[PDB]
Amino acid sequence: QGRVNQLGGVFINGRPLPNNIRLKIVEMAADGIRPCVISRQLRVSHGCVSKILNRYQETGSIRPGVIGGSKPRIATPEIENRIEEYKRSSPGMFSWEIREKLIREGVCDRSTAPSVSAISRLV
DNA sequence: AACGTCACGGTTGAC
DNA sequence: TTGTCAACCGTGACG
């Protein structure tokens, strides 16, 4: 649902500014226009202008960050939780040792056991 | 008067 | 299939 900000600029709460506006903020910055002017001219909150400008400097892109989705779980299951729970053995507790404890405890099978390398990555 | 930073109420999508 | 949840969003306000 489209809404209006204090400066009279249209925006959708939760969603990124449309590309046409993002593109314009950057064009203006390249023209030597001060950020505060871009704010009043385009009617975008200055906090937003600042963000988009700082991001263009870091990433070199107009496009917004990646929204939504689940981080890839290569080392999937509650197993990950069990590996963190092994915070009592922690120091000295080798990567391969963890794999063995995961098997005799019941949480993991011999066929479905994570490689010690993967556990190193997770730990 | 300019602008860096962040809580807030919000939406999204990979698994 | 439907739902969970951590990633991001822009505004508005503070310093």
In this structure, are residues A2 and A11 in contact, taking their beta carbons and an 8 Å threshold?
A: yes
What H or E segment, with its residue span, contains residue A53? helix A46-59
Do the domains at A1-68 and A69-123 have one common CATH topology? Answer: yes
As a whole number of angstroms, the distance between CA A44 and CA A25 comes to: 9
CA of A4: nucleotide with nearest C1': C11
Task: Report which DSSP code applies to A2.
Answer: E
**What CATH architecture applies to the domain A69-123?**
Orthogonal Bundle (1.10)
CA of A37 to C1' of B1 (A): 12
Distinct helix (H) and strand (E) counts, chain A: 6, 2
- Amino acid at residue number A83: I
Q: What class does CATH assign to A1-68? A: mainly alpha
The tokens of A25 are what? 């903020």
Please state how this structure was obtained. Answer: X-ray
Strand C contact at CB of residue A35, distance < 7 A? no
As a whole number of angstroms, the distance between CA A96 and CA A117 comes to: 9
Where along chain A do its domains lie?
A: 1-68, 69-123
As a whole number of angstroms, the distance between CA A82 and CA A97 comes to: 13
Residues constituting chain A? 123
Which residue minimizes Cα–C1' distance to B12? Answer: A68
Sign of CA dihedral A47, A50, A54, A59: positive
In this structure, are residues A43 and A52 in contact, taking their beta carbons and an 8 Å threshold?
A: no
CA of A70: nucleotide with nearest C1': B14
Q: What residues pair up with A11 in beta bridges, in sequence order? A: A3
